[PDB]
Design a protein around this ligand. Sequence first.
Ligand SMILES: *[C@@H]1O[C@H](CO)[C@@H](O)[C@H](O)[C@H]1NC(C)=O
Ligand code: NA
Ligand code: NA
Ligand code: NA
Lengths: 99, 7, 275
Amino acid sequence: IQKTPQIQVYSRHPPENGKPNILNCYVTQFHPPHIEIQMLKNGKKIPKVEMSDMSFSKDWSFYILAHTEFTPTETDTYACRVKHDSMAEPKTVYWDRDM
Amino acid sequence: MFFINTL
Amino acid sequence: GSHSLRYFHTAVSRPGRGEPQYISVGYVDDVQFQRCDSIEEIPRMEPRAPWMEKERPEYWKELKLKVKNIAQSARANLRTLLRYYNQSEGGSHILQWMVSCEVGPDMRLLGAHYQAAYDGSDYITLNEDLSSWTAVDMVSQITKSRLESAGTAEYFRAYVEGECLELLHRFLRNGKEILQRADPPKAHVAHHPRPKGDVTLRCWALGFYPADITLTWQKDEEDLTQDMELVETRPSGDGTFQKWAAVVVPSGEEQRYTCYVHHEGLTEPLALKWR
Ligand SMILES: *[C@@H]1O[C@H](CO)[C@@H](O)[C@H](O)[C@H]1NC(C)=O
Ligand code: NA
Ligand code: NA
Ligand code: NA
């Protein structure tokens, strides 16, 4: 059964400009388990993105957390880009400091 | 760490 | 106050290059303690929580053998499933299963689970009696008949009352400071004007453990179930979870709305308003 991922991008701690933090991309509710996840800063791929182990929920769908160190500012933009076989094209979600 | 062969 | 040992197992036929044929992750409650996998027949194990440094070398040697054996048996299970469902060779299929035991505060066993899924759908489940099974279709009914004619649930109960209890007891002792705890949510309401002139009120809850939580918005006397946007509870990455719920409200009506937070670490629901 094919399930499309749901994607959330958010900070470990509430953001304050100029203070080191951790950016999370949490990808849930997808099946089968193969997934491709990248994080970007100001249009450049971040090389040091850590990936949690993949696990799954009671409905058998898979979940995984990608994360990287980051320092929010008033001018930098961050994105997480996700590709799964349920999707014709990748999906990009940008960090919003309000959510 | 346990598995049951289903068939 | 209860605690569970849980393992989440996945076996993939024809994984991609570099991808596991078999992976399992083990948790106590909402804290992962290890990863096991097998890639091109090579088993590998990694600890994920600090108390695992106290395990002795024979734990990891016995576990490596169990990974090799489970990976081979799961591969063979995938091949039999392919045949019984008259599916074509060449595709990749998925076999998942969950194994758990649960104890109460006096460390007495309360229950246990064994349940399996094929290609993302229920296949067979052990019932709460720990002796009989529930199938979904005539293939899984063959499995049921084999397991019951054989008495296989006896060996599962031996695992629950042996190694499952042994490890749950030892992990709760060595990991007591992490596992026997409830961190309460730190809550607040944020306020975001919208270009149209109304307002988003976003009730936040952060820093809480375990993950289970409820967030609800309520108006003076009106029901907001269909009005609020709730995000899936999500890990912050340091052992704690975070969540929010939001409603859009007319400007000047903000004090009519209250956010209620329910969590095990609270004695009564938290009630928050903006500002
Ligand atoms: C597969 O074929 C057998 C007959 O050889 C039949 O009993 C079984 O119902 C078939 N399964 C499906 C899913 O069609
Ligand atoms: Na919202
Ligand atoms: Na709880
Ligand atoms: Na309010």
